[PDB]
Single-chain antibody
Framework: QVQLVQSGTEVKSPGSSVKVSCKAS????????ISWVRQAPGQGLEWMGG????????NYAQKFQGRVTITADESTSTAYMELSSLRSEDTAVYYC??????????????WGQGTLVTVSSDIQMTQSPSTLSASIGDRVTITCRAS??????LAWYQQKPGKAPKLLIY???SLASGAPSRFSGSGSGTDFTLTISSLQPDDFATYYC?????????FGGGTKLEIK
């Protein structure tokens, strides 16, 4: 009964600013963090930053050069993301997500529905294959490779078209609450794999890996799993 309800679509002109809200319910707000991740074709999933409200500590991706401000109101269980001097390339779907930890360097167990915002050195994560066709009942294995050692600080997500990502695996091999047991994660260091035993019809989706070893938090390009 954890919910993250985001505000509506934002239609913007370049140079302007946008403030997005994320209303949380069903849990103790101060016990967790709220992060922001945007998604657009071409850049894929990109981390903006996060806030740990109880500590009032915020971390942002350096790329944004201070243009992003993340705040939180514990009185109303609401987090905000403000993005200044808007560019054409900031056009994306912006998600808020719960970081079930005490740090902004984490994985996200619950995601909001997303907010469309229209305008007008790091650890590289490489996923393979990019697309995969398979049949119901098959064993499928997906790879993720980090440009440097990340120990076991890797998470896997499932994303259905136009929906919020869903956490499947964290700590490289731990199964997320409510994720099907046919999903398993393996790896340590630089090479990781997600395996689905007995592919079900509900498993056709896009799969992403994410490191949370250090900042900036980075994601793979995704593996689209298709039928036949």
């Amino acid at each position: 009964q954890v919910q993250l309800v985001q505000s509506g679509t934002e239609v913007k002109s370049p140079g302007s600013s946008v403030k997005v809200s994320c209303k949380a319910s069903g849990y103790t707000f101060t016990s967790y963090g709220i992060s922001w991740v945007r998604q657009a074709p071409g850049q894929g999933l990109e981390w903006m930053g996060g806030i740990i409200p109880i500590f009032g500590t915020a971390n942002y991706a350096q790329k944004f050069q201070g243009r992003v401000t993340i705040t939180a109101d514990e009185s109303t269980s609401t987090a905000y993301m403000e993005l200044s001097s808007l560019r054409s390339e900031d056009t994306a779907v912006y998600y808020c997500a719960r970081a079930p930890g005490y740090s902004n360097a984490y994985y996200f167990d619950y995601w909001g529905q997303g907010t469309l915002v229209t305008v007008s050195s790091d650890i590289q994560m490489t996923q393979s294959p990019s697309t995969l066709s398979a049949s119901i009942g098959d064993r499928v294995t997906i790879t993720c490779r980090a440009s440097e050692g990340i120990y076991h600080w890797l998470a896997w997500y499932q994303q259905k078209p136009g929906k919020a990502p869903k956490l499947l695996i964290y700590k490289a091999s731990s199964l997320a609450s409510g994720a099907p047991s046919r999903f398993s994660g393996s790896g340590s260091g630089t090479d990781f794999t997600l395996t689905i035993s007995s592919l079900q019809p509900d498993d056709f989706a896009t799969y992403y890996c994410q490191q949370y070893s250090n900042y900036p938090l980075t994601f793979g390009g995704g593996t689209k799993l298709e039928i036949k």
